[PDB]
Protein backbone atom coordinates (compact mmCIF):
# COMPACT_ATOMS: atom_id res chain seq x y z
CA UNK A 1 0.00 0.00 0.00
CA UNK A 2 1.04 3.62 -0.58
CA UNK A 3 3.14 5.47 2.03
CA UNK A 4 1.68 8.65 3.69
CA UNK A 5 5.06 10.45 4.31
CA UNK A 6 7.04 12.25 1.56
CA UNK A 7 10.25 10.34 0.51
CA UNK A 8 12.23 13.68 0.41
CA UNK A 9 11.16 15.58 3.62
CA UNK A 10 9.62 12.65 5.67
CA UNK A 11 6.39 14.69 6.36
CA UNK A 12 2.67 14.08 5.58
CA UNK A 13 0.37 16.21 3.33
CA UNK A 14 -0.97 16.18 -0.24
CA UNK A 15 1.39 13.67 -1.91
CA UNK A 16 1.81 12.14 -5.42
CA UNK A 17 1.86 8.31 -5.79
CA UNK A 18 4.40 6.34 -7.83
CA UNK A 19 2.89 3.86 -10.28
CA UNK A 20 5.67 1.21 -9.74
CA UNK A 21 6.68 1.50 -6.04
CA UNK A 22 4.96 2.57 -2.70
CA UNK A 23 6.91 5.89 -2.40
CA UNK A 24 5.01 9.20 -2.24
CA UNK A 25 6.29 12.80 -2.76
CA UNK A 26 5.18 16.44 -2.25
CA UNK A 27 5.02 18.09 -5.73
CA UNK A 28 7.00 21.07 -4.24
CA UNK A 29 9.78 18.78 -2.85
CA UNK A 30 10.55 17.75 -6.51
CA UNK A 31 9.92 21.37 -7.84
CA UNK A 32 7.14 20.18 -10.30
CA UNK A 33 1.11 7.07 -14.99
CA UNK A 34 3.99 8.84 -13.20
CA UNK A 35 7.20 6.98 -12.16
CA UNK A 36 9.23 8.51 -9.28
CA UNK A 37 13.00 9.48 -9.47
CA UNK A 38 14.08 6.30 -7.59
CA UNK A 39 12.28 4.07 -10.14
CA UNK A 40 13.62 6.12 -13.12
CA UNK A 41 17.28 5.78 -11.94
CA UNK A 42 16.90 2.00 -11.40
CA UNK A 43 15.23 1.42 -14.82
CA UNK A 44 18.12 3.21 -16.65
CA UNK A 45 20.75 1.33 -14.56
CA UNK A 46 19.16 -2.12 -15.35
CA UNK A 47 18.67 -1.55 -19.13
CA UNK A 48 21.54 -3.27 -21.05
CA UNK A 49 21.88 -0.27 -23.42
CA UNK A 50 22.42 2.26 -20.58
CA UNK A 51 23.94 0.11 -17.72
CA UNK A 52 27.31 1.14 -16.16
CA UNK A 53 30.78 -0.33 -16.97
CA UNK A 54 30.73 -2.20 -13.61
CA UNK A 55 27.32 -3.79 -14.43
CA UNK A 56 28.55 -4.78 -17.96
CA UNK A 57 31.30 -6.95 -16.28
CA UNK A 58 29.01 -8.56 -13.62
CA UNK A 59 26.25 -11.20 -13.54
CA UNK A 60 23.35 -10.80 -10.94
CA UNK A 61 24.92 -13.60 -8.83
CA UNK A 62 28.36 -11.87 -8.87
CA UNK A 63 26.80 -8.53 -7.78
CA UNK A 64 25.03 -10.41 -4.89
CA UNK A 65 28.43 -11.59 -3.57
CA UNK A 66 29.76 -7.95 -3.52
CA UNK A 67 26.58 -6.66 -1.77
CA UNK A 68 27.22 -9.20 1.07
CA UNK A 69 30.60 -7.42 1.77
CA UNK A 70 28.81 -4.00 1.64
CA UNK A 71 26.34 -5.29 4.35
CA UNK A 72 29.34 -6.20 6.60
CA UNK A 73 30.68 -2.62 6.38
CA UNK A 74 27.18 -1.19 7.15
CA UNK A 75 26.90 -3.44 10.32
CA UNK A 76 29.46 -1.33 12.29
CA UNK A 77 29.57 -1.68 16.17
CA UNK A 78 26.70 0.34 17.69
CA UNK A 79 24.15 -0.28 14.85
CA UNK A 80 22.28 -2.94 16.95
CA UNK A 81 18.88 -1.17 16.73
CA UNK A 82 18.86 -1.59 12.89
CA UNK A 83 20.28 -5.17 12.60
CA UNK A 84 16.89 -6.94 13.02
CA UNK A 85 13.22 -5.94 12.25
CA UNK A 86 11.55 -3.56 14.75
CA UNK A 87 9.63 -5.80 17.24
CA UNK A 88 5.95 -4.75 16.84
CA UNK A 89 5.06 -6.21 20.29
CA UNK A 90 7.59 -3.80 21.90
CA UNK A 91 6.38 -0.74 19.82
CA UNK A 92 2.64 -1.52 19.34
CA UNK A 93 1.87 1.65 17.37
CA UNK A 94 4.84 1.24 14.90
CA UNK A 95 2.67 -0.12 12.01
CA UNK A 96 0.26 2.88 12.28
CA UNK A 97 3.15 5.08 10.90
CA UNK A 98 5.54 2.62 9.13
CA UNK A 99 3.95 0.78 6.18
CA UNK A 100 7.22 -0.50 4.62
CA UNK A 101 9.62 -1.63 7.37
CA UNK A 102 13.28 -2.40 6.60
CA UNK A 103 16.44 -3.47 8.53
CA UNK A 104 19.98 -4.85 7.79
CA UNK A 105 18.98 -8.55 8.21
CA UNK A 106 16.16 -8.26 5.62
CA UNK A 107 18.49 -6.31 3.27
CA UNK A 108 21.08 -9.16 3.61
CA UNK A 109 18.48 -11.89 2.82
CA UNK A 110 17.12 -10.03 -0.26
CA UNK A 111 20.75 -9.65 -1.57
CA UNK A 112 21.38 -13.43 -1.10
CA UNK A 113 18.13 -14.30 -2.99
CA UNK A 114 19.41 -12.15 -5.97
CA UNK A 115 16.63 -9.49 -5.65
CA UNK A 116 18.89 -6.57 -6.79
CA UNK A 117 19.74 -5.94 -10.48
CA UNK A 118 22.03 -2.90 -9.89
CA UNK A 119 23.83 -0.98 -7.08
CA UNK A 120 21.20 1.84 -7.27
CA UNK A 121 18.41 -0.66 -6.30
CA UNK A 122 20.28 -1.82 -3.11
CA UNK A 123 20.83 1.81 -1.88
CA UNK A 124 17.15 2.73 -2.67
CA UNK A 125 15.94 -0.20 -0.50
CA UNK A 126 18.50 0.55 2.30
CA UNK A 127 17.09 4.14 2.49
CA UNK A 128 13.74 2.84 3.98
CA UNK A 129 15.76 2.27 7.24
CA UNK A 130 16.50 6.06 7.51
CA UNK A 131 13.04 7.25 6.24
CA UNK A 132 11.25 5.02 8.83
CA UNK A 133 13.59 6.07 11.70
CA UNK A 134 12.90 9.80 11.02
CA UNK A 135 9.08 9.34 10.89
CA UNK A 136 8.83 7.21 14.07
CA UNK A 137 11.67 8.52 16.28
CA UNK A 138 11.99 12.09 14.95
CA UNK A 139 14.69 13.94 12.99
CA UNK A 140 16.75 14.80 16.13
CA UNK A 141 16.74 11.37 17.91
CA UNK A 142 20.05 9.53 18.70
CA UNK A 143 18.97 6.59 16.47
CA UNK A 144 18.45 8.94 13.48
CA UNK A 145 22.16 9.92 13.67
CA UNK A 146 23.13 6.19 13.61
CA UNK A 147 20.80 5.52 10.58
CA UNK A 148 22.28 8.52 8.64
CA UNK A 149 25.83 7.06 9.06
CA UNK A 150 24.58 3.55 7.90
CA UNK A 151 23.20 5.16 4.65
CA UNK A 152 26.49 7.10 4.09
CA UNK A 153 28.45 3.79 4.42
CA UNK A 154 26.04 2.13 1.89
CA UNK A 155 26.49 5.11 -0.57
CA UNK A 156 30.31 4.83 -0.29
CA UNK A 157 30.35 1.02 -0.84
CA UNK A 158 28.06 1.29 -3.93
CA UNK A 159 30.38 4.02 -5.34
CA UNK A 160 33.41 1.72 -4.76
CA UNK A 161 31.73 -1.23 -6.63
CA UNK A 162 31.01 1.17 -9.56
CA UNK A 163 34.65 2.44 -9.79
CA UNK A 164 35.97 -1.13 -10.35
CA UNK A 165 34.37 -4.36 -8.97
CA UNK A 166 37.69 -6.29 -9.15
CA UNK A 167 39.59 -3.68 -7.07
CA UNK A 168 36.63 -3.72 -4.62
CA UNK A 169 36.73 -7.53 -4.13
CA UNK A 170 40.57 -7.48 -3.83
CA UNK A 171 40.37 -4.77 -1.10
CA UNK A 172 37.62 -6.77 0.74
CA UNK A 173 39.52 -10.11 0.92
CA UNK A 174 42.98 -8.56 1.56
CA UNK A 175 45.16 -11.44 0.25
CA UNK A 176 48.96 -10.82 0.55
CA UNK A 177 49.96 -8.18 -2.09
CA UNK A 178 46.25 -7.58 -2.99
CA UNK A 179 47.11 -4.08 -4.34
CA UNK A 180 49.53 -5.71 -6.92
CA UNK A 181 46.80 -7.89 -8.48
CA UNK A 182 46.13 -6.77 -12.12
CA UNK A 183 42.47 -6.26 -13.19
CA UNK A 184 40.99 -7.78 -16.40
CA UNK A 185 41.15 -4.29 -18.09
CA UNK A 186 44.49 -3.22 -16.41
CA UNK A 187 44.70 0.28 -14.89
CA UNK A 188 47.56 2.39 -16.41
CA UNK A 189 50.57 3.05 -14.15
CA UNK A 190 51.52 6.77 -13.70
CA UNK A 191 53.80 9.24 -11.91
CA UNK A 192 51.21 11.53 -10.19
CA UNK A 193 51.92 14.90 -8.47
CA UNK A 194 49.33 16.30 -6.00
CA UNK A 195 49.97 19.97 -4.92
CA UNK A 196 52.15 19.88 -1.78
CA UNK A 197 53.16 16.18 -2.19
CA UNK A 198 56.18 14.55 -3.98
CA UNK A 199 55.76 12.81 -7.41
CA UNK A 200 54.70 9.21 -6.59
CA UNK A 201 53.79 5.94 -8.43
CA UNK A 202 50.03 5.25 -8.75
CA UNK A 203 47.30 3.31 -10.61
CA UNK A 204 44.94 5.53 -12.73
CA UNK A 205 41.36 4.19 -12.12
CA UNK A 206 39.15 6.94 -13.69
CA UNK A 207 39.08 10.23 -15.68
CA UNK A 208 36.58 13.01 -14.70
CA UNK A 209 36.48 16.85 -15.22
CA UNK A 210 40.22 17.02 -16.15
CA UNK A 211 41.19 14.89 -13.08
CA UNK A 212 42.57 11.35 -12.57
CA UNK A 213 41.45 9.06 -9.68
CA UNK A 214 44.98 8.01 -8.49
CA UNK A 215 45.58 5.06 -6.02
CA UNK A 216 49.12 5.31 -4.63
CA UNK A 217 51.59 2.43 -4.17
CA UNK A 218 52.86 1.98 -0.60
CA UNK A 219 50.26 3.59 1.72
CA UNK A 220 47.32 2.77 -0.67
CA UNK A 221 45.79 6.23 -0.23
CA UNK A 222 43.80 8.06 -2.96
CA UNK A 223 43.26 11.51 -4.51
CA UNK A 224 41.87 13.28 -7.58
CA UNK A 225 45.04 14.62 -9.40
CA UNK A 226 45.04 17.14 -12.38
CA UNK A 227 45.66 15.31 -15.69
CA UNK A 228 48.60 17.67 -16.54
CA UNK A 229 50.34 16.49 -13.30
CA UNK A 230 50.24 12.75 -14.48
CA UNK A 231 52.91 11.10 -16.69
CA UNK A 232 53.00 7.51 -18.00
CA UNK A 233 55.42 5.32 -15.97
CA UNK A 234 59.12 5.66 -16.97
CA UNK A 235 62.60 4.42 -15.81
CA UNK A 236 63.83 8.05 -15.19
CA UNK A 237 62.16 9.45 -12.02
CA UNK A 238 60.67 13.02 -11.80
CA UNK A 239 62.63 13.99 -8.64
CA UNK A 240 60.94 15.55 -5.57
CA UNK A 241 62.49 16.39 -2.13
CA UNK A 242 61.15 13.65 0.33
CA UNK A 243 61.23 13.26 4.15
CA UNK A 244 61.92 9.45 4.37
CA UNK A 245 63.80 7.45 1.70
CA UNK A 246 62.70 3.96 2.89
CA UNK A 247 58.97 4.78 2.37
CA UNK A 248 59.68 5.73 -1.30
CA UNK A 249 61.80 2.56 -1.76
CA UNK A 250 58.92 0.33 -0.44
CA UNK A 251 56.43 1.98 -2.88
CA UNK A 252 58.81 1.43 -5.86
CA UNK A 253 59.36 -2.24 -4.74
CA UNK A 254 55.55 -2.84 -4.60
CA UNK A 255 55.21 -1.13 -8.02
CA UNK A 256 57.79 -3.54 -9.55
CA UNK A 257 55.80 -6.56 -8.16
CA UNK A 258 52.66 -5.15 -9.97
CA UNK A 259 54.65 -4.78 -13.29
CA UNK A 260 55.93 -8.44 -13.14
CA UNK A 261 52.33 -9.64 -12.42
CA UNK A 262 51.09 -7.64 -15.48
CA UNK A 263 53.83 -9.23 -17.71
CA UNK A 264 52.82 -12.76 -16.61
CA UNK A 265 49.04 -12.24 -17.16
CA UNK A 266 49.12 -10.10 -20.38
CA UNK A 267 52.65 -10.79 -21.66
CA UNK A 268 53.71 -7.09 -21.97
CA UNK A 269 54.41 -3.80 -20.06
CA UNK A 270 55.83 -0.80 -21.95
CA UNK A 271 57.75 1.86 -19.99
CA UNK A 272 57.57 5.30 -21.71
CA UNK A 273 60.21 8.06 -22.36
CA UNK A 274 60.62 10.62 -19.54
CA UNK A 275 57.73 13.13 -19.20
CA UNK A 276 55.32 11.43 -21.60
CA UNK A 277 51.82 12.81 -20.64
CA UNK A 278 49.10 10.44 -19.41
CA UNK A 279 45.99 10.62 -21.71
CA UNK A 280 42.41 9.39 -20.82
CA UNK A 281 41.92 5.59 -21.17
CA UNK A 282 45.59 5.21 -22.24
CA UNK A 283 46.44 1.94 -24.13
CA UNK A 284 50.28 2.64 -24.49
CA UNK A 285 51.41 0.12 -21.79
CA UNK A 286 49.52 -2.81 -23.44
CA UNK A 287 50.69 -2.17 -27.10
CA UNK A 288 52.45 -5.06 -28.89
CA UNK A 289 54.96 -2.51 -30.35
CA UNK A 290 54.99 0.94 -28.62
CA UNK A 291 56.50 2.53 -31.81
CA UNK A 292 53.56 1.22 -33.98
CA UNK A 293 50.20 1.99 -32.21
CA UNK A 294 48.15 1.04 -35.33
CA UNK A 295 49.12 -2.64 -34.63
CA UNK A 296 47.14 -2.42 -31.35
CA UNK A 297 47.15 -4.50 -28.16
CA UNK A 298 49.35 -7.56 -27.39
CA UNK A 299 46.48 -9.42 -25.56
CA UNK A 300 45.77 -12.62 -27.57
CA UNK A 301 42.28 -13.41 -26.08
CA UNK A 302 41.08 -17.05 -25.79
CA UNK A 303 37.26 -16.36 -25.41
CA UNK A 304 37.66 -16.97 -21.66
CA UNK A 305 34.50 -16.89 -19.53
CA UNK A 306 36.98 -16.66 -16.49
CA UNK A 307 35.96 -14.15 -13.77
CA UNK A 308 34.80 -16.26 -10.71
ZN1 LIG B 1 8.12 16.57 1.05
ZN1 LIG C 1 8.84 4.61 -7.57
ZN1 LIG D 1 40.53 -2.53 -10.74
XYZ file of C-alpha atoms and ligand atoms in Angstrom:
311
model
C 0.000 0.000 0.000
C 1.039 3.623 -0.583
C 3.137 5.466 2.026
C 1.684 8.648 3.689
C 5.059 10.448 4.313
C 7.043 12.251 1.562
C 10.249 10.342 0.508
C 12.226 13.681 0.408
C 11.160 15.576 3.616
C 9.619 12.645 5.669
C 6.392 14.688 6.364
C 2.669 14.078 5.575
C 0.374 16.211 3.330
C -0.968 16.184 -0.237
C 1.385 13.667 -1.906
C 1.814 12.139 -5.419
C 1.861 8.306 -5.786
C 4.399 6.340 -7.827
C 2.886 3.856 -10.284
C 5.666 1.208 -9.740
C 6.676 1.505 -6.041
C 4.958 2.573 -2.703
C 6.908 5.891 -2.400
C 5.014 9.200 -2.245
C 6.290 12.800 -2.757
C 5.175 16.438 -2.252
C 5.016 18.095 -5.730
C 7.004 21.073 -4.239
C 9.778 18.775 -2.846
C 10.549 17.754 -6.507
C 9.916 21.372 -7.844
C 7.136 20.178 -10.301
C 1.111 7.071 -14.993
C 3.991 8.838 -13.200
C 7.200 6.981 -12.158
C 9.229 8.509 -9.279
C 12.995 9.481 -9.471
C 14.082 6.299 -7.592
C 12.284 4.068 -10.138
C 13.616 6.124 -13.122
C 17.278 5.782 -11.944
C 16.896 1.995 -11.404
C 15.227 1.425 -14.824
C 18.120 3.211 -16.653
C 20.748 1.329 -14.561
C 19.164 -2.119 -15.350
C 18.669 -1.550 -19.134
C 21.544 -3.272 -21.052
C 21.877 -0.266 -23.423
C 22.419 2.265 -20.578
C 23.938 0.106 -17.721
C 27.311 1.136 -16.163
C 30.776 -0.328 -16.972
C 30.725 -2.196 -13.610
C 27.319 -3.787 -14.431
C 28.548 -4.780 -17.957
C 31.298 -6.948 -16.280
C 29.008 -8.556 -13.615
C 26.249 -11.204 -13.543
C 23.354 -10.799 -10.945
C 24.923 -13.601 -8.834
C 28.358 -11.871 -8.870
C 26.802 -8.533 -7.782
C 25.027 -10.412 -4.890
C 28.426 -11.592 -3.569
C 29.762 -7.955 -3.517
C 26.584 -6.662 -1.770
C 27.224 -9.197 1.073
C 30.597 -7.425 1.775
C 28.811 -3.999 1.645
C 26.335 -5.293 4.347
C 29.336 -6.202 6.601
C 30.682 -2.624 6.380
C 27.179 -1.188 7.151
C 26.904 -3.436 10.321
C 29.462 -1.331 12.293
C 29.568 -1.681 16.173
C 26.700 0.336 17.691
C 24.152 -0.276 14.848
C 22.276 -2.936 16.946
C 18.881 -1.168 16.732
C 18.861 -1.589 12.886
C 20.282 -5.172 12.598
C 16.893 -6.937 13.024
C 13.218 -5.937 12.248
C 11.547 -3.564 14.747
C 9.628 -5.804 17.236
C 5.951 -4.751 16.836
C 5.061 -6.208 20.288
C 7.590 -3.801 21.897
C 6.376 -0.737 19.818
C 2.639 -1.521 19.336
C 1.868 1.646 17.374
C 4.836 1.237 14.899
C 2.665 -0.117 12.013
C 0.261 2.881 12.284
C 3.154 5.079 10.905
C 5.539 2.619 9.134
C 3.949 0.781 6.179
C 7.221 -0.503 4.623
C 9.618 -1.631 7.373
C 13.284 -2.402 6.596
C 16.436 -3.473 8.530
C 19.983 -4.852 7.786
C 18.979 -8.549 8.206
C 16.155 -8.263 5.622
C 18.495 -6.315 3.273
C 21.081 -9.162 3.609
C 18.481 -11.894 2.824
C 17.122 -10.030 -0.263
C 20.752 -9.648 -1.570
C 21.380 -13.434 -1.097
C 18.131 -14.300 -2.994
C 19.405 -12.150 -5.970
C 16.628 -9.487 -5.654
C 18.895 -6.566 -6.793
C 19.742 -5.937 -10.484
C 22.031 -2.897 -9.887
C 23.827 -0.978 -7.078
C 21.199 1.841 -7.273
C 18.409 -0.657 -6.303
C 20.285 -1.815 -3.114
C 20.832 1.810 -1.878
C 17.154 2.734 -2.666
C 15.942 -0.199 -0.495
C 18.499 0.546 2.298
C 17.087 4.143 2.489
C 13.737 2.844 3.976
C 15.761 2.268 7.237
C 16.499 6.055 7.506
C 13.036 7.254 6.239
C 11.252 5.021 8.829
C 13.589 6.066 11.702
C 12.900 9.798 11.019
C 9.083 9.339 10.891
C 8.826 7.213 14.072
C 11.668 8.518 16.281
C 11.989 12.093 14.947
C 14.685 13.937 12.990
C 16.750 14.801 16.130
C 16.742 11.372 17.913
C 20.053 9.530 18.695
C 18.972 6.589 16.474
C 18.447 8.942 13.482
C 22.160 9.924 13.666
C 23.130 6.193 13.615
C 20.801 5.524 10.577
C 22.283 8.522 8.636
C 25.833 7.060 9.060
C 24.581 3.549 7.895
C 23.203 5.161 4.653
C 26.486 7.098 4.089
C 28.445 3.789 4.422
C 26.038 2.132 1.886
C 26.493 5.115 -0.570
C 30.305 4.830 -0.287
C 30.353 1.015 -0.843
C 28.057 1.295 -3.933
C 30.377 4.024 -5.340
C 33.413 1.723 -4.764
C 31.734 -1.233 -6.631
C 31.009 1.173 -9.563
C 34.649 2.445 -9.788
C 35.971 -1.126 -10.349
C 34.366 -4.359 -8.972
C 37.692 -6.292 -9.148
C 39.586 -3.682 -7.070
C 36.626 -3.715 -4.624
C 36.729 -7.526 -4.131
C 40.567 -7.483 -3.831
C 40.366 -4.774 -1.105
C 37.619 -6.773 0.739
C 39.518 -10.110 0.916
C 42.982 -8.562 1.561
C 45.160 -11.443 0.245
C 48.956 -10.819 0.547
C 49.962 -8.183 -2.093
C 46.254 -7.583 -2.986
C 47.108 -4.083 -4.340
C 49.533 -5.708 -6.916
C 46.802 -7.889 -8.480
C 46.127 -6.766 -12.124
C 42.470 -6.259 -13.189
C 40.991 -7.780 -16.404
C 41.153 -4.291 -18.090
C 44.489 -3.216 -16.413
C 44.703 0.277 -14.888
C 47.560 2.385 -16.406
C 50.567 3.047 -14.149
C 51.515 6.773 -13.700
C 53.803 9.239 -11.915
C 51.214 11.530 -10.188
C 51.916 14.900 -8.468
C 49.326 16.298 -5.996
C 49.968 19.967 -4.919
C 52.155 19.879 -1.778
C 53.165 16.184 -2.192
C 56.180 14.550 -3.982
C 55.761 12.810 -7.412
C 54.700 9.208 -6.586
C 53.788 5.935 -8.426
C 50.027 5.249 -8.754
C 47.301 3.308 -10.608
C 44.942 5.532 -12.735
C 41.362 4.194 -12.121
C 39.153 6.944 -13.685
C 39.077 10.232 -15.685
C 36.575 13.014 -14.698
C 36.481 16.848 -15.223
C 40.219 17.016 -16.147
C 41.190 14.891 -13.084
C 42.572 11.346 -12.566
C 41.451 9.062 -9.677
C 44.978 8.009 -8.490
C 45.581 5.058 -6.024
C 49.118 5.310 -4.634
C 51.587 2.429 -4.172
C 52.857 1.982 -0.600
C 50.264 3.594 1.717
C 47.318 2.773 -0.675
C 45.785 6.228 -0.232
C 43.800 8.062 -2.962
C 43.258 11.506 -4.515
C 41.867 13.281 -7.585
C 45.038 14.620 -9.402
C 45.038 17.142 -12.383
C 45.657 15.308 -15.694
C 48.604 17.672 -16.540
C 50.339 16.495 -13.305
C 50.238 12.748 -14.476
C 52.908 11.104 -16.695
C 53.002 7.512 -17.999
C 55.424 5.316 -15.973
C 59.123 5.656 -16.967
C 62.598 4.425 -15.814
C 63.829 8.047 -15.193
C 62.162 9.448 -12.025
C 60.670 13.021 -11.795
C 62.635 13.986 -8.644
C 60.939 15.555 -5.568
C 62.488 16.388 -2.129
C 61.154 13.645 0.329
C 61.235 13.258 4.146
C 61.916 9.450 4.374
C 63.804 7.454 1.702
C 62.698 3.958 2.888
C 58.969 4.775 2.366
C 59.675 5.734 -1.296
C 61.797 2.558 -1.762
C 58.916 0.334 -0.440
C 56.428 1.982 -2.882
C 58.813 1.433 -5.856
C 59.361 -2.241 -4.740
C 55.552 -2.836 -4.598
C 55.207 -1.126 -8.019
C 57.787 -3.539 -9.545
C 55.795 -6.560 -8.165
C 52.658 -5.155 -9.966
C 54.652 -4.782 -13.288
C 55.928 -8.437 -13.144
C 52.329 -9.636 -12.420
C 51.093 -7.645 -15.483
C 53.830 -9.227 -17.705
C 52.816 -12.757 -16.607
C 49.035 -12.244 -17.163
C 49.120 -10.096 -20.377
C 52.647 -10.791 -21.662
C 53.711 -7.089 -21.966
C 54.413 -3.799 -20.057
C 55.832 -0.801 -21.951
C 57.750 1.863 -19.987
C 57.574 5.299 -21.713
C 60.207 8.064 -22.362
C 60.623 10.615 -19.536
C 57.729 13.129 -19.196
C 55.316 11.430 -21.604
C 51.818 12.805 -20.639
C 49.098 10.437 -19.411
C 45.993 10.615 -21.710
C 42.411 9.388 -20.816
C 41.916 5.588 -21.166
C 45.590 5.214 -22.239
C 46.441 1.942 -24.134
C 50.279 2.638 -24.491
C 51.407 0.123 -21.787
C 49.525 -2.808 -23.444
C 50.692 -2.172 -27.104
C 52.447 -5.063 -28.890
C 54.962 -2.510 -30.354
C 54.990 0.943 -28.624
C 56.502 2.527 -31.813
C 53.555 1.221 -33.984
C 50.199 1.986 -32.205
C 48.145 1.044 -35.333
C 49.121 -2.636 -34.632
C 47.144 -2.420 -31.349
C 47.150 -4.502 -28.162
C 49.353 -7.555 -27.388
C 46.480 -9.425 -25.563
C 45.771 -12.616 -27.570
C 42.276 -13.414 -26.075
C 41.084 -17.049 -25.795
C 37.263 -16.363 -25.413
C 37.656 -16.975 -21.661
C 34.502 -16.895 -19.531
C 36.976 -16.665 -16.490
C 35.956 -14.152 -13.768
C 34.799 -16.256 -10.713
Zn 8.116 16.571 1.048
Zn 8.835 4.615 -7.571
Zn 40.530 -2.535 -10.741
